[PDB]
Design a protein around this ligand. Structure first.
Ligand SMILES: *[C@@H]1O[C@H](CO)[C@@H](O)[C@H](O)[C@H]1NC(C)=O
Ligand SMILES: *[C@@H]1O[C@H](CO)[C@@H](O)[C@H](O)[C@H]1NC(C)=O
Ligand SMILES: *[C@@H]1O[C@H](CO)[C@@H](O)[C@H](O)[C@H]1NC(C)=O
Ligand SMILES: *[C@@H]1O[C@H](CO)[C@@H](O)[C@H](O)[C@H]1NC(C)=O
Ligand SMILES: *[C@@H]1O[C@H](CO)[C@@H](O)[C@H](O)[C@H]1NC(C)=O
Ligand SMILES: *[C@@H]1O[C@H](CO)[C@@H](O)[C@H](O)[C@H]1NC(C)=O
Ligand SMILES: *[C@@H]1O[C@H](CO)[C@@H](O)[C@H](O)[C@H]1NC(C)=O
Ligand SMILES: *[C@@H]1O[C@H](CO)[C@@H](O)[C@H](O)[C@H]1NC(C)=O
Ligand SMILES: *[C@@H]1O[C@H](CO)[C@@H](O)[C@H](O)[C@H]1NC(C)=O
Ligand SMILES: *[C@@H]1O[C@H](CO)[C@@H](O)[C@H](O)[C@H]1NC(C)=O
Ligand SMILES: *[C@@H]1O[C@H](CO)[C@@H](O)[C@H](O)[C@H]1NC(C)=O
Ligand SMILES: *[C@@H]1O[C@H](CO)[C@@H](O)[C@H](O)[C@H]1NC(C)=O
Lengths: 120, 108, 123, 118, 121, 122, 109, 122, 109
């Protein structure tokens, strides 16, 4: 009910309740370039979620543990006392390590599930 | 868990049959049974696997069969060096992976 | 394939003991591994199984909450850490190769290349 | 065939969903047409995704049916109606239904997030 | 580690562990837009075809269609350890449409069975 | 509606017997089917249930193995193949219509059309 | 699974009640408790399904109801041709689909 | 922080009470709630747990089919509806905070604050 | 579910240990053990949570620890105000979330 980015200045534990509002707002040569680049950004994000095994979800839990070197904070100060913009700035240039770990964890999970489903 | 007679006997040169009876959910449901030969004091050797297959290194005197919930091993000709405790093993699904029987004394 | 146990052999009731297997004659990472237990005079029973990659472990219910099986493809080493050992766990523990295969390999569901067996006695 | 089940009853037309699918994806006017088809496909896929129905053609939900939307029984709905007549009958409530579906998913993931946190 | 197509000449087993590396490289004046739209359409047709089979969101998807020995009678050891994906893809030419049709029909039956199972009170 | 149970007779303990049921008077493929067992002196007991399309089968725990229920919608034929029959399985079996329906149909958790019955002796 | 009386009786023209007592997880959880009439030597036929919904082909009598975990069949206007066994069939969820009680013999005096 | 149970007292076996608990002095919607019981001569035993949003309910197996736990965050009200009370259910029922957290807080696998308790006699 | 001694005693100025014994699937695996103090006729107060962590409002004379499958509450001071029934509680995972021991009557002589 807050609207697009209305929760942007709210805390992470409150802004996380409005993910569908943000998701629904993501979708002559210049106009086609703008539409194609919007489609490409959406598809790259969806493919990246699929690689992690999070396709079809907005809140996706994973098997990658949190490193204290990425952000040495407790859940209360992360979720109740700061916004997603401040968090995004705080963990800048740590996201590529997290993405690589998520990719490797999903590859291992897919192999383990295939082997479990291969037992008679 | 898996029922196997405690011993068999026979003369050299005779055909000797050893059998194990399980249940419908393991021998009856799966075609993955195996037989092992354990000499006293030594580790067991794989003799038969799956259904009447022999691994490399095992002579063709060891064969077997499967019918219903009963599996069997046949020794086409008894030898003095065959004296050992024979064991059955069978796959029983994902909750109970393997079920073993007791030992059979060949008594050559 | 000279699969040899290097584990211990004497523990008190309620203590812990680690067993391990070393392999040399085969590609260790290509085969599943298991531990099979032989109590004296009672025959053999399967205790635990680990996949070829080490990600999956399976146990009998009687040890599911006590034993941890792990493997290291580097140095070709299988390990089994047994906690809270009971008097019923006195037995010879054999290393075995197989009992499982990945979806890209043929089926096994049998044990091969058995080790010589470590003797574990619980006082 | 494509739209062949449009005149069939819904109970029979629901078994041809893969026939109706695949026909949604396949000089500036042709490029605008391709981009428009892709945009509509992605809008529909996102709309399914926010409902927890991604990757499925028949998706069951946790939203109860309100008798004020339609008071027909299942025999009349599925054996005596086509999808076109049904779509006409309940068009005035479609967006309301969509909103409720979205809300259910908003709750569902949170519950799953808690269940996996135990 | 091996790059975009580095596993192309490796065995099918080894190459099956590099699916994400190739998956990332499928998405990234009028003719440039035409090229981008063609890339998007090919990606979306492949994702849709996986979705029809119930494989959406997975790169390795197990199914309920048994393998027919008339398509290929090689055992798993020969297919996965002694053959590459290019040679395999050549071997199963003229059979992929039958497999795709069987996968579509199997998933339709799976969806009806799941809907009926979920209809039990 | 008529259900004719052209089943078997007497078998030994440990043997196998197949029952069949021919349906007429209704669209066979539109209804779920079941087998219900009546042991003399005990009363009715449900044995197995199969969906209208034949893809889903359900059993009581006591016969969850050993029994296979099969449906042929082209010949309007229901069948039940019982392996490893026990002495406790001696009973009159009945072919019955209903008990499951489907998601797109009305609720039908009842058996409305019953067959003549067939005697299985073990 | 569920408890029934071994027999009931009454005079012609009187009303009788047959009850089935199950548990909270079957009768108390699902409103699908049908009742069947089986003449000895003949297959049973459906007398009432769900709880209170009578199928076509059955006279006005044999109406049923439920309360708590107990289902009840009321047979008013008892006729001489009703001398048959009566059975309950209760839905018990997905793991166990249907449960039956023993037969109740209806004796017409 | 206060918790006051306002539920009923003496009930016959097979009856119901529908106990309730009023919370004050803290943010009700931020904490999970639970009901824990003590028989008059025995120790204290947990009965049921509900999360902070009310969507998830958990029970001990002994009461799983007869107790319903619910909450209303707009009235600061917790409810427990017992519809099949047995003679063994005689106990003091305490309303308590804690028992779980909804993933975005720290763990709360303890009972942070307890009410005074309602007496259920049956 | 949990084994706990029925009573313990000591003199003012000394300290006591109250043990609580579970199994490997609950105390040993989750490390979520709490202790609380119940006076007869009164509601219990939380004294220890997360095995070792003391909440606010409780002085340092109450502490705890665990070893293996055994949890332990250490109480120093032993003043008259501590004459109460102490209970241990442990998280067992989902499907029977919490398990409790019996009460320990602490007698202050
Ligand atoms: C802004 O901060 C205040 C401080 O308490 C808070 O009450 C308010 O809700 C915040 N705004 C939003 C949109 O959450
Ligand atoms: C991540 O954690 C590991 C130990 O878990 C640590 O060695 C490593 O340094 C951490 N990452 C970074 C970037 O420091
Ligand atoms: C989180 O860390 C901050 C840093 O000082 C601290 O002030 C706050 O109390 C901590 N919260 C919790 C719940 O541990
Ligand atoms: C990585 O991110 C942190 C976040 O503040 C930043 O301080 C640091 O400079 C970044 N690293 C580099 C190499 O810029
Ligand atoms: C059109 O209606 C008739 C009515 O009998 C039916 O038989 C026919 O199948 C219907 N057409 C289609 C395509 O289902
Ligand atoms: C059904 O719709 C009406 C208005 O259309 C609404 O008032 C009612 O609350 C809805 N039903 C439910 C169960 O919410
Ligand atoms: C559905 O409603 C219509 C009303 O026209 C009625 O004729 C029909 O019998 C109903 N179907 C069922 C199965 O109750
Ligand atoms: C939908 O609304 C319009 C006007 O708002 C009305 O004319 C139309 O009949 C309505 N549709 C239905 C199916 O009632
Ligand atoms: C190419 O073939 C050789 C055969 O010896 C193999 O060792 C090598 O790994 C193969 N290349 C790649 C990239 O896997
Ligand atoms: C394989 O294809 C042939 C082609 O006619 C078919 O007859 C056979 O049944 C197929 N195999 C299986 C297992 O369905
Ligand atoms: C697979 O087939 C080839 C060719 O017949 C054969 O050489 C090889 O041994 C087979 N492998 C297995 C595991 O059956
Ligand atoms: C597919 O069909 C063509 C048609 O001539 C044939 O040349 C080719 O060999 C076939 N593929 C295989 C794998 O046999």
């Amino acid at each position: 009910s807050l609207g697009f980015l209305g929760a942007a200045g709210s805390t992470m534990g409150a802004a996380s309740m409005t993910l569908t509002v943000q998701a629904r707002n993501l979708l002559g040569i210049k106009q086609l370039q703008a539409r194609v680049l919007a489609v490409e950004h959406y598809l790259r994000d969806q493919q990246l979620l699929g690689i992690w095994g999070c396709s079809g979800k907005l809140i996706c839990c994973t098997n990658v543990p949190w490193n204290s070197s990425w952000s040495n904070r407790n859940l209360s100060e992360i979720w109740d006392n700061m916004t997603w913009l401040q968090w995004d700035k705080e963990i800048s240039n740590y996201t590529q390590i997290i993405y690589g770990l998520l990719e490797e964890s999903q590859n291992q999970q897919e192999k383990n599930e295939q082997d479990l489903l291969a037992l008679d | 868990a898996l029922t196997q007679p405690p011993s068999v006997s026979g003369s050299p040169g005779q055909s000797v049959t050893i059998s194990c009876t399980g249940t419908s959910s393991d021998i009856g449901s799966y075609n993955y049974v195996s037989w092992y030969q354990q000499h006293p004091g030594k580790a067991p050797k794989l003799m038969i696997y799956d259904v009447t297959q022999r691994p490399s290194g095992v002579s063709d005197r060891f064969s077997g069969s499967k019918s219903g919930n009963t599996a069997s091993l046949t020794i086409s000709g008894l030898q003095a060096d065959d004296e050992a405790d024979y064991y059955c093993s069978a796959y029983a699904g994902r909750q109970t992976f393997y079920i073993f029987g007791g030992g059979t004394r060949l008594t050559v | 394939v000279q699969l040899v146990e290097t584990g211990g052999g004497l523990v008190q009731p309620g203590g812990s003991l680690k067993l391990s297997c070393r392999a040399s004659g085969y590609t260790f990472s290509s085969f599943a591994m298991s531990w099979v237990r032989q109590a004296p005079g009672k025959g053999l029973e399967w205790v635990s199984l680990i996949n070829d990659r080490g990600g999956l472990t399976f146990y009998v219910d009687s040890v599911k909450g006590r034993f941890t099986i792990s493997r290291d493809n580097s140095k070709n080493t299988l390990s089994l850490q047994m906690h809270s050992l009971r008097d019923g766990d006195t037995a010879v523990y054999y290393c075995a190769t197989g009992g499982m295969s990945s979806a890209l390999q043929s089926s096994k569901y049998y044990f091969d290349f058995w080790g010589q067996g470590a003797l574990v006695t619980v006082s």
